[PDB]
Ligand binder design. Structure first.
Ligand SMILES: Nc1ccn([C@@H]2O[C@H](CO)[C@@H](OP(=O)(O)O)[C@H]2O)c(=O)n1
Length: 124
């Protein structure tokens, strides 16, 4: 019965690789972090930075969330990210994903004590 913090870590942290090497990256990770479970999640980002590097973003540039909440934060620097997106071919439980590897800034929603990332709002 996962915390919000632990859930974000399971969804979004990939500190083990520096980048998506393969086109297959999304397919394996989405399945592997248990995200194709009941359904094919349409979009999920994975962050190839340290967990402390991503926790620090909660203290960077404060922006609106796309929900117009005001507890989101843009990283000052770019970061290695893998964007995973369902193709139109895709058919649950046979989820298929297009892998895009980029260096982008991330925007996260933080909460709690400690104030850590609980949502992945977007990358820019
Ligand atoms: N750019 C984006 C946009 C959405 N998402 C995923 O899609 C969801 C929004 O519907 C996110 O939920 P969380 O912010 O709870 O992680 C997230 O896990 C993402 O991972 N990257």
């Amino acid at each position: 019965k996962e915390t919000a913090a632990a859930k974000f870590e399971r969804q979004h942290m990939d500190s083990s690789t520096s980048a998506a090497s393969s086109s297959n990256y999304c397919n394996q990770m989405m399945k592997s972090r248990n995200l194709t479970k009941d359904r094919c999640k349409p979009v999920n980002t994975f962050v190839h930075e340290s967990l402390a590097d991503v926790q620090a973003v909660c203290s960077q540039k404060n922006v609106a969330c796309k929900n117009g909440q005001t507890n989101c934060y843009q990283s000052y620097s770019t970061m290695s990210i893998t964007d995973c997106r369902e193709t139109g071919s895709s058919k649950y439980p046979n989820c298929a994903y297009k892998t895009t590897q980029a260096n982008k800034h991330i925007i996260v929603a933080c909460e709690g004590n400690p104030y850590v990332p609980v949502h992945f709002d977007a990358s820019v």
